[PDB]
Each structure stands twice: as C-alpha cells, then as structure tokens.
C-alpha cells in the first residue's frame, strides 16, 4: 500500500487466481478468451492482473513470422483464426484506451483505479540498466517459478538486463526504414506497437507522479522531484553525456540526412534470437510502400521526442534537471540542425505534417520555428513567431518582414551549379512556415492577411522568373497554391 495500491475485493480475487491458474497450465488460448468474451458486454471491466500483463508483454513479442511452429504446437485447432501475438497486442491496446479515459459514467471507479494499479505495477518493473515479488497476499501467482514463455524469456526480465532497454529502442528505430522482410517485420508488428505502449504508459505514470508525489514545496526542490521521476529513468537509459549530439542521432538513426557522426553507428542487434529470420511455412502478404514505411516511422520518432518536451517543460525557469543533465534549449537546436538537414524531403513533410495536431502541440511549434531559424542562417536573423502565435497581426508583420528580408526568394546569380541542393534548402524552409501557419489557423479559430498574400505572390513570382531565367524545363517549388487554399 505504498502508493496507488488498491486492494482486492473477493469478486476480483476469483478472476485474479483463475487467470494465473490457466496461464500456469501453458494454456494461453483460454487465458486470452477469458478477457475477450466479456469485454464490451457489461459494466464490469474484468481487469487483467499485473502479472498477466508481463505475460501479454511476452506473448506479444513472438509473432508467426519467426515462430510459426511454436504458435501451432500450442493450439493446433486455431478456433479464433488469429495468433497468440495478434490477440495479446489487441488486448494491451484495448485495455489502454480504457485507462486513458477514466470514464466513470459506465464502469465503476474501483475497477478503473484497480486497472491503473495493475498497469503501474507492470511498468514499474521495467528498470533500465546501463552498460519476483507479488505485492498481494490473497493468491499465489505465476512468474514465481515460471521464467520463460514459449521460449521467449520475458519482457520485464530482459529489459532490465544491462544495456538492453537502449538496444531495443535502436532496434525498433533502425529497422523501421528497412527493405528486407526479416528485418522490417521485426519492427512493424513486434517492437513498433510495443514501444508505442511503453511510451504511452511511461507518459501516464508521469501524469500521476506529478500530483500524487508534495504541494506547496520550494522550487529548488521541486526540480529534485523530477530526477527520480518515471520519465527521468526512462531517458536515463541514454548512456552518453552529449544529448546535443546523441539524442539528435538516436531518434533519427536509420534516416539519411547529412549524417556527420564520425563515430561508428550504434551496434544494433536483435532482442530475442531468431528475430531476423523469416520461417519457411509463412509468406508475407501485406505490401508496405516505402512511403508508408517512412510515415509510421516518423510518427514514432516524433512521439519519442514528444515525451522529452513533456519532462523538460516541467523544469522551472530557475534551475535545470539533474538526473538527465539536459536543457530544454540544447534539444530544440539539436532536433533542428538535423531536421533542417534531411535529404529526402518526403520524410521532412512526414515528420512535420503530423496526423495528431492538437496533442502534439507545445513542441512542434518550437522545432518548426527552431528549424526555420537554422535554415535562414545559410539563406540570409531573429525569429519571434511562436511568441506571436496568439495575435495574428504580429505574426503577419513578422512574416512580411521576413519575406522582405529576402529569405524566401532564391539566392544570388549562382543558379545551375548547385541547383539540386539550393532548391531542397529553400523548400525545406517553406514547410516550417506552412506548419506554423497551420498552427496559427488552428490556434486562432484582416488586411494583414491580404498583405502577406500579395507579398508571397511577388516572392513566388520572383522565384518563378528566376527559374525561367535558369533555362530550366520545370517549375520551381512554389508556395502560394498552398496558402491560398489554406486561407480560402
């Protein structure tokens, strides 16, 4: 009963000791069938025990693409027409969309507070190192004498190994943009939706640890209650003191921007053996386009930084965080000197043009302006756009000042010698402006807009005539046709 601990009513104890008995008999089909048969039926919320989470965290990391025989020698009938790893994942993502609602209008608050206890007990076992204790007493559980599940050891028992919660992050990030099926599948249905759960839970334990830690405490010590925070040990796994040049290259591992890291790339190895091997009796069917590959791998690289500008946002203006030893300004010019360095501009758009615009606020209109300020240092300044993101008149006046400052028109007479890089550079500084414009249009719900309109008309026409004088067979990367249709 240290904190968030909820005791067991006898009507939940039965389902607690029954699921563990079923799981002890190597019978996971019925363990899963226990939860699914009573999911959307009534207002009961049959919660998973906290040790039947570390089982679904290990039933998830064994997909048929490399363990087809073992998934068949367990239940050779396959009643549900699904595997053990595609239903475990479908439960963890179904009992998580319930946790982050806390809707008491249908469930009972006791079940919703018990489920949170199970989830936090589960995610309080993942303690990353660098290189069993059941809190209840009513029942004896599994995971006391059982170590491995179908060969795969465990998740809590493996991520705690020295230098392993850092290798699996680089595993799911580097093999994100891969072409070989044995490698791309190891991070599309095994480690990509599993890190999206770990990050979404480590970022919900933080939402609780802040309130129910010490109200009315000194600011100098409130920052000391963020060094033992759950989001602090998570980012403590990064075993370097160069977050200005290490967190900017761990998020973008397999991306190809202008990689200047003279140090050798991080050694990436599989978590469980046989992961980078497809099996003979399974042939893939889903065709993943290279654009689709680099759309769901940049919605995770951004989601992994979006949990770093939520830990750093809580640092008070006076002091700085102790355990990670990082600054909320050394990682806005670090995720901007590489974002402004991308070669494939279809990855740049996939990163900035996000499908979750409202939740992923508070840090995107910081890298967007932070990146536009990194490009104009070569195109030829002080950017105050985010401070003017609330009042449109000031943001306008600034953008007309910028376009009059000749930072959106092309460079000097050098046209064809270095066109291939100049066009990419000048168009990469247009997405940031477009992203900021979209945010303003969403954060604000007159004549200055029209003045920006005609100014951008003259600028675009200047680029157009410059490209015409470039004896070039195609159009320049115009701006206008986007802003015109955005405004209306």
């Amino acid at each position: 009963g240290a904190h968030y601990f909820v005791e067991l009513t006898e009507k939940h104890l039965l389902a607690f000791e029954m699921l563990n008995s079923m799981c002890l008999l190597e019978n996971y089909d019925h363990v899963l069938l226990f939860l699914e048969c009573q999911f959307g039926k009534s207002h009961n919320l049959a919660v998973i025990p906290f040790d039947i989470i570390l089982v679904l965290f290990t039933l998830s990391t064994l997909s048929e693409y490399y363990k087809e025989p073992i998934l068949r020698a367990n239940d050779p009938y396959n009643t549900s027409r699904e595997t053990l790893s595609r239903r475990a994942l479908k439960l963890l993502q179904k009992y998580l969309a319930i946790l982050k609602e806390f809707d008491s209008e249908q469930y009972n608050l006791y079940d919703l507070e018990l489920l949170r206890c199970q989830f936090f007990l589960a995610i309080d076992t993942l303690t990353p190192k660098k290189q069993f204790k059941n809190p209840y007493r009513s029942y004896i559980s599994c995971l006391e004498q059982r170590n491995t599940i179908l060969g795969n050891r465990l998740l809590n028992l493996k991520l705690n190994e020295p230098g392993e919660f850092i290798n699996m992050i680089l595993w799911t990030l580097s093999n994100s943009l891969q072409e070989s099926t044995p490698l791309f599948l190891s991070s599309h249905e095994i480690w990509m939706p599993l890190l999206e759960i770990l990050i979404d839970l480590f970022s919900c334990r933080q939402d609780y640890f802040i309130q129910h830690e010490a109200q009315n405490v000194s600011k100098s010590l409130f920052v000391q209650r963020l060094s033992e925070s759950p989001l602090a040990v998570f980012f403590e796994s990064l075993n370097t003191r160069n977050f200005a040049n290490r967190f900017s290259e761990y998020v973008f591992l397999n991306c190809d921007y202008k990689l200047p890291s003279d140090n050798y790339a991080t050694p990436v190895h599989p978590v469980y053996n046989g992961e980078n091997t497809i099996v003979d009796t399974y042939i893939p069917t889903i065709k993943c386009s290279p654009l689709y590959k680099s759309q769901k791998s940049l919605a995770l690289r951004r989601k992994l930084i979006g949990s770093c500008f939520k830990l750093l946002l809580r640092v008070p203006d006076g002091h700085r965080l102790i355990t990670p030893r990082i600054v909320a300004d050394d990682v806005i010019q670090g995720i901007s000197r590489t974002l402004a360095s991308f070669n494939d501009i279809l990855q740049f758009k996939k990163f900035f043009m996000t499908e979750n615009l409202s939740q992923e606020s508070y840090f995107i209109p910081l890298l967007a302006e932070g990146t536009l300020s990194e490009i104009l240092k070569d195109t030829q300044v002080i950017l105050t756009l985010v401070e003017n993101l609330s009042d449109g008149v000031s943001f306008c006046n600034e953008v007309i000042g910028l376009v009059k400052s000749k930072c959106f028109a092309f460079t000097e007479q050098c046209s064809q010698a270095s066109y291939e890089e100049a066009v990419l550079n000048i168009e990469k500084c247009d997405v940031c402006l477009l992203v900021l414009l979209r945010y303003l249009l969403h954060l604000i719900g007159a004549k200055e807009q029209l003045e920006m309109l005609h100014a951008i008309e003259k600028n675009d026409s200047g680029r157009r005539q410059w490209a015409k004088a470039l004896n070039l067979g195609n159009d320049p990367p115009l701006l206008y046709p986007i802003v015109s249709q955005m405004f209306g």
Binding site: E17, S21, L24, L25, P76, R137, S138, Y139, I140, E144
Partner: protein, 348 residues
C-alpha cells in the same frame, strides 16, 4: 431441489455383521457413525457391490460367497434411487423411485432383479441395472469415488512429489487415455513398414490427441481452482503444479506468518495433512459424479486437526445439490461445525 439420482433407503439381509440392516440417507452430505469393527465397512462394500462391483473388485472378499456370514445360507441387498427431479427416465413405467434387488444364494447364479415403485420385478438383466447406474452419472466402475478404508488410506498417507500425480491421474481417469492412445509408437510406426490408402487410421489418431490435451486442460484446471478455494479455511494461500516432464504434483503453500511460498514437504504434520485432504477433495471435483463415499480419513491426522478436516468437508460438500456424500467415520462429530444447518443428515 436436488436432481434425481440419490439413494433413499438401504436394506441388508444377513451380511458380514448385519443380520437385518436398514438405513435412510439424504440428498446431501450424509454422515454415519459407529466404532471400529462395527460393520461400517460392510455397508460400503454392499453399496459398491450392489451396483457394478464384481466378486474380486474389492481385494477384501475373494468371491461372492464369503460375503455371507458363516452359518447363514444366502444374502440379499436392496437399494432405492430417487426419481423426482431431472433424471427421472420413463418415470411413468415405475413411478418416483427405482428399486434394485441383488440376491446371492449359497449355490447358483446371482439374480440382478430390478423392481418398480410398488416392488414388483420389472427386469433381471445386469445390463439394465448397469445402464440405470451409469445414467444417473454413477461412477460405479471408478475405484476412487467409493474409496475403501485402505484405498482411501493409499491417498491420504505419506506421499512424494511424483506419487500424488499418479494418484490424481489414476483417480481422474487420465491414465486411461494416455495409454489407450499411447500405443501409437507401434500402430502408426511399425504398422506401415511393408513396402519400404491405409494411412486413414493415422489420420483419425492425430485428431484424437487433441481430445486428450483439451480434456487435460479443463480437468486439471478444475482440480486446481478447488484447491485454492479450500486453502482459504485456514487462511492460507497456494496452488498445485503439474509437471509432465517429471509427472509431478509439487504443491506450493504460503501461510499468514510466511513471506514467500515454500514446498509442502517443509512444514509440520498438520499443514501437510490438511493439504493432502484438500487434494483428496480436489480430485473428485473435475469428474461429475452423483454419489461419493469415503472411509477412515483419520489414518494419520489427529483429532484436533480432524475437526478442521471435518469443517472443511462440511463447507465444501454440504452446499452442493448434486453430489450425495456417504462419508463413514466412527466418532460422532456433529458438535463443532454447522451440522444443524440444512444439508446434513448425520445417522447412527
């Protein structure tokens, strides 16, 4: 009320120690009492033999003639089965009860006459009484349900890890399908080497190991849930684990004063005896019978702990409305538990 298939009355005639015995039992936990050597085993032997047992199916009587007391000429056994609730097959033919008659003479065949409500013979074939017994889901054949004084003593005694597994498997009829379908090492292997579609037999046999593994998961899980729910009358916790690699029944328990569950064979006599009695109770759970007997559960458990065993038996068995227990024990023990509650029919 209780579904049909419970014994109303039992009448004997010139048995091992009873000249003319008449008992009446209820549709639930039914204690009967006495003392050592009072014919308590005689009634259990008669109730086993009166349905499906053979002359040498008890290992105590050598034939069907030694049962008759010396000096007597013959013997007679007659039982009554209730037919009022679910299970009253063709009740219009007989009535609301079924009467059987097992008469054994000094010389000649033993008649197996079946009677109706008014006591007139309606059948004499062994097959008729056998299908009557096996319809009401009676486990006559089974050598566990109607455990003898020594048969039950074989379970509730000094056991090891890979001995309770054997007892549980044999009692649960799970050492019958792992032998009737384990000779496949010669019927699918050595019965095909004559040319190096007759493999249809191997096709059915592969769709039959599913039947065993899906009836050993749901039958060894029901006997494990009713072992954690019977360790909660001493404020204990724990479970029992089947190891097919070793064929073992390691049972792990955790007491109020304990911090980490240990193996059963590390405690005093009382907790081990309680755990083994709990396992004995759990064995009967998966197999849906209708009549269960027992004799002499005081083999090694002291009276102070035999009282706790009695309370366990009373809570676990009295509430069930579909298992007529006929437990036999000499001492009168209706003075500690809730025997006054409806569902107990202690008889002397």
């Amino acid at each position: 009320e209780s579904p049909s298939g419970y014994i109303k009355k039992v009448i004997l005639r010139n048995f091992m120690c009873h000249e003319h015995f008449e008992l009446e039992l209820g549709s639930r936990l039914n204690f009967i009492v006495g003392n050592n050597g009072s014919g308590k085993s005689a009634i259990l032997t008669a109730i086993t033999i009166g349905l499906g047992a053979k002359a040498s199916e008890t290992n105590r009587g050598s034939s069907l003639k030694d049962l008759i007391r010396e000096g007597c000429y013959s013997a007679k056994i007659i039982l009554h089965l209730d037919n009022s609730k679910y299970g009253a097959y063709q009740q219009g033919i007989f009535g609301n009860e079924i009467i059987v008659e097992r008469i054994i003479k000094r010389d000649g065949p033993a008649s197996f006459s079946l009677r109706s409500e008014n006591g007139k013979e309606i059948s004499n074939k062994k097959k008729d009484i056998q299908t009557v017994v096996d319809y009401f889901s009676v486990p006559v054949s089974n050598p566990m349900c109607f455990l003898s004084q020594d048969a039950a003593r074989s379970f509730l005694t000094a056991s090891t890890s890979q001995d309770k597994y054997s007892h549980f498997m044999k009692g649960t009829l799970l050492q019958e399908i792992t032998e009737n379908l384990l000779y496949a090492s010669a019927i699918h292997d050595s019965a095909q080497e004559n040319m190096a579609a007759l493999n249809r037999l191997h096709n059915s046999l592969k769709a039959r190991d599913q039947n065993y593994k899906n009836a050993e998961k749901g039958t060894c899980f029901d006997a494990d849930m009713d072992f954690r729910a019977s360790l909660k009358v001493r404020k204990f916790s724990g479970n029992l684990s089947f190891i097919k690699d070793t064929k073992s029944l390691e049972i792990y328990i955790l007491t109020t004063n304990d911090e980490k569950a240990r193996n059963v064979d590390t405690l005093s006599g009382g907790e081990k005896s309680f755990s083994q009695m709990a396992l004995l109770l759990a064995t009967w759970k998966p197999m849906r019978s209708r009549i269960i007997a027992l004799d002499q559960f005081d083999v090694f458990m002291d009276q102070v702990n035999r009282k706790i065993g009695t309370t366990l038996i009373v809570k676990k068995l009295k509430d069930i409305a579909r298992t007529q227990t006929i437990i036999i024990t000499p001492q009168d023990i209706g003075k500690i538990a809730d025997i006054d509650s409806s569902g107990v029919s202690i008889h002397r």
